[PDB]
Ligand binder design. Structure first.
Ligand SMILES: COc1ccc2c(c1)N(CCC/C=C/c1cccc3c1N[C@H](C)CC(=O)N3)CCO2
Length: 119
């Protein structure tokens, strides 16, 4: 055992950053996820009425760079928050929804062997 394993920030960064890079490499699918949503600039002013906890790729990257994840599952939770936000907000025919579904397929594939490596 019950002694909690400690993960050091550079260990998490080396292990998890490639999985984030794999999401960035999806193009066009990552393009709507690369920056924080600005609802007025994007023409979606209802966004924060629906999505209470925004998350995007640039924020996840900054959190890894600044040691804000103590456990790999906290990083997984933010990636999944980003996915769940987009499945909640967008209509099922929209680009962002279908792009989200593809990013979730890619992330599932990438994160699995990394979680095995971290344990
Ligand atoms: C919109 O779809 C595409 C598809 C391809 C693209 C672009 C846009 N743009 C603009 C990228 C920035 C746009 C974000 C965005 C806009 C409207 C609704 C949502 C957006 N995303 C976040 C996750 C919030 C959300 O849930 N929905 C770049 C070229 O490639």
């Amino acid at each position: 055992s019950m002694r909690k394993k400690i993960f050091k920030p550079e260990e998490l960064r080396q292990a998890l950053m490639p999985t984030l890079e794999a999401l960035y490499r999806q193009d066009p699918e990552s393009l709507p996820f690369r920056q924080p949503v600005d609802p007025q600039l994007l023409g979606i002013p209802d966004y924060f009425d629906i999505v209470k906890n925004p998350m995007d790729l640039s924020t996840i990257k900054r959190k890894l760079d600044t040691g804000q994840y103590q456990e790999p599952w906290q990083y997984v939770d933010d990636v999944w928050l980003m996915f769940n936000n987009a499945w909640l907000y967008n209509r099922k025919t929209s680009r962002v929804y279908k792009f989200c579904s593809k990013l979730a397929e890619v992330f599932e594939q990438e994160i699995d062997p990394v979680m095995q490596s971290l344990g």
